[PDB]
């Protein structure tokens, strides 16, 4: 009996086709991902191959304008259109709270939603019991496969699930579920969860009876051979884990943002053991046509996004000075607002605990194009934010050394006075430049917000220390110079869309009032 597991993880509301780095689509001939393209690929696989099981590991919530306008309704609708067989709860599913999880997704979804290690207590236990299951027994072909869900224990720190939910240990909660499944005469068990690649390997090694592990939460790319795109694999697909029982357990993951469709083929005997397992994620690039019906549905749903583009997100007391004469020469309150938006968005809901303490932000001055006027009753609309940030990039999290950061700041003022856009607006950084000095020594003061310290305070940069900072994807991929960044990254993670982040921050800050606080000074 051969089973074909198709899976996606950490889609992050990338409904429309995106670029090679999850940014907004510009060149249609080079765009990847999308719900419509995934629909075509899954339809081809289903028509061509018998036992097909499409699964989601979580984090379908949050990331684009779709989640702000529809609040997860679009996710449930299009995952019903794609006919997912099961989905595991992720940390981002608890964005907007349990109230924002139950109504849009848990009620509208037709597929089971699984999380074994989530326990409800108090008044919530009555309103959420039965909406998410510890496991699901799905008949695939003539056989039966059990799927056990799990979510990372870090969900309270990475999201806002509330108090009425307890996230128990993954192994200690998965073991009784797997034992109950094997009691029900289910010999094919899949651990579909959202706890990260390392915890997936731990579950494969420790939990007895688990045959395959489909994971997420880490955007880990696994490939066997020459990779089809810029993603560098962290291992072979599938990653074979030697369990304590002597079995070999595949562990699979398909990066993130719907760019890849994880594709695995497993051979089971009569006893349910795995004999062989092989496959590779499928790059959903332009060679795969988008399904016309799903594309038409996406265009139909885009009407509400276009209407929301003219809606008032909030108000501003002060003039948002996003002019090139200000944001490319000196500290501008628009740059401070955008850095605060990035930092607050990252801290409110974080992809991983690795980035949950990031307080440092840099943003090139060429990324701010137009200002926002407060004379229009102070209203800020999505159209104004699109004018400010028209490139449709993302806000990525990047780990650097102190030397890399100081060299980036030196480059930001390497050619000052020529109106170039490399001048970095900063957040959680106090930088003082001495323009009289030669380039490469113009950054005379550079203090950054300590994170390991109990009380954050601005401490001087250390060149051998390692700092986590939020950048535009334009800067992380090079951009206006800044080749030293791209060359000397230690870790990189793509993030939410730029205008999405700014608009969400302005929605939370119903009235904004950023000021020139002295984050950038000149001696």
């Amino acid at each position, epitope marked *: 009996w051969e089973l074909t597991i198709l899976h996606t993880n950490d889609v992050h509301s990338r409904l429309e086709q995106t670029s090679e780095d999850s940014s907004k689509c510009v060149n249609a001939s080079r765009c990847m991902g999308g719900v419509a393209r995934l629909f075509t690929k899954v*339809q081809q696989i*289903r*028509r061509a191959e*018998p*036992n*097909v099981l499409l699964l989601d590991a979580g984090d379908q919530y949050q990331g684009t304008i779709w989640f702000t306008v529809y609040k997860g309704a679009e996710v449930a609708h299009f995952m019903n*259109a794609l*006919r997912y067989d099961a989905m595991a709860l992720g940390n981002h599913e608890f964005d907007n709270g349990v109230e924002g999880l139950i109504e849009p997704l848990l009620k509208e979804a*037709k597929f089971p939603i699984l999380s074994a290690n989530i326990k409800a207590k108090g008044p919530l236990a009555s309103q959420i019991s039965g909406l998410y299951l510890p496991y699901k*027994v*799905l*008949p695939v*072909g*003539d056989e*039966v496969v059990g799927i056990v869900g799990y979510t990372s224990k870090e969900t309270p720190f990475l999201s806002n699930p509330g108090t009425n939910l307890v996230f128990e240990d993954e192994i200690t909660a998965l073991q009784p579920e797997v034992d109950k499944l094997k009691t029900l005469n289910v010999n094919k068990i899949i651990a579909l969860g959202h706890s990260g690649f390392e915890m997936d390997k731990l579950i494969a090694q420790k939990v007895r009876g688990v045959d395959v592990v489909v994971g997420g939460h880490s955007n880990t790319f696994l490939y066997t051979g020459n990779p089809p795109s810029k993603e560098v694999p962290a291992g072979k697909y599938p990653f074979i884990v030697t369990s304590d029982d002597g079995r070999k357990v595949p562990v699979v993951q398909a990066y993130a943002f719907g760019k890849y469709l994880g594709y695995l083929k497993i051979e089971f005997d009569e006893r349910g053991n795995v004999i062989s397992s092989h496959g590779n994620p499928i790059l959903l690039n332009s060679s795969i046509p988008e399904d016309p*019906s799903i594309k038409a549905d996406i265009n139909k749903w885009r009407i509400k996004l276009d209407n929301y583009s003219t809606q008032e997100l909030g108000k501003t007391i002060v003039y948002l000075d996003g002019s090139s004469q200000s944001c490319r020469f000196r500290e501008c309150n628009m740059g401070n607002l955008i850095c605060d938006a990035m930092i607050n968005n990252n801290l409110r809901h974080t992809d991983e605990m690795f980035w949950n303490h990031v307080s440092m932000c840099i943003l090139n001055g060429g990324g701010i194009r137009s200002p926002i006027d407060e004379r229009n009753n102070g209203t800020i609309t999505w159209e104004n934010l699109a004018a400010v940030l028209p490139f449709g990039g993302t806000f990525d999290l990047v780990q650097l050394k102190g030397s890399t950061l100081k060299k980036a700041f030196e480059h930001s003022v390497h050619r000052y006075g020529q109106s170039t856009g490399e001048f970095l607006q900063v957040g959680g950084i106090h930088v003082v430049y001495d323009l009289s000095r030669k380039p490469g020594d113009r950054v005379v003061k550079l203090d950054v917000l300590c994170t390991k310290c109990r009380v954050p305070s601005y401490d001087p940069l250390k060149m051998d220390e390692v700092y986590k900072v939020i950048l535009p994807n334009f800067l992380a991929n090079g951009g206006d110079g800044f080749q030293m960044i791209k060359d000397e990254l230690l870790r990189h993670d793509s993030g939410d869309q730029d205008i999405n982040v700014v608009s969400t921050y302005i929605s939370k800050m119903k009235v904004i009032y950023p000021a020139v606080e002295g984050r950038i000074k000149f001696s």
Partner: antibody
Amino acid sequence: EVQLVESGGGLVQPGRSLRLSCAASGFTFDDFAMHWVRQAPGKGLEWVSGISWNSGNIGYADSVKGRFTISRDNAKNSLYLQMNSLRAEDTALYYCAKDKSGSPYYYYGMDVWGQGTMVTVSS
Amino acid sequence: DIQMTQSPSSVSASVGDRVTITCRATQGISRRLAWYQQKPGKAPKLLIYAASSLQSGVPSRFSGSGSGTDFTLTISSLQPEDFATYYCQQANSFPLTFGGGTKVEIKR
């Protein structure tokens, strides 16, 4: 959401022909095998026809084989049943049913049934 | 054709009891068996689509079991909304024959 609307049923003389049509609204029509089911007044269910997604696999009940013809238009999301050489034993409520399985290689029963159309054959 | 027989032709049960309906094919059909429930004047609804696989939105009250040639539908702790006609249907291969039906009636 999912919905199936039947039309074309009505009075017809024995030995004549009819063409039942079924419009599908809220699902991917070209992914599911589509069935015509028949329920006589006061009697049980009787599966009379079924067609695959690409019309490659077509099946008829032994009592309707050689007379009926199932077909589908995926572009119009429609299912058709041509009924030739009808008899007084063919009067019943016809259901246009959608197969539950999304796999072309399996049948998982029928999960969506449209309201039946009454086909009465009498002189 | 795989002729399928359903027993009993009619069962009279009281609210709260357990109802057992048996379905037997003329040949082994693995677990390719479905159970439908139909009310008077309404289209049939799918309760079980594979042997022992409950349909979404259907109470765990109904339970499917069996394999090969013999299958069984059990309605434990019957309720007034379960007095209808239940059909078993083999989904093995064309033709997909239905069963004779089994009416669940209120016992008085």
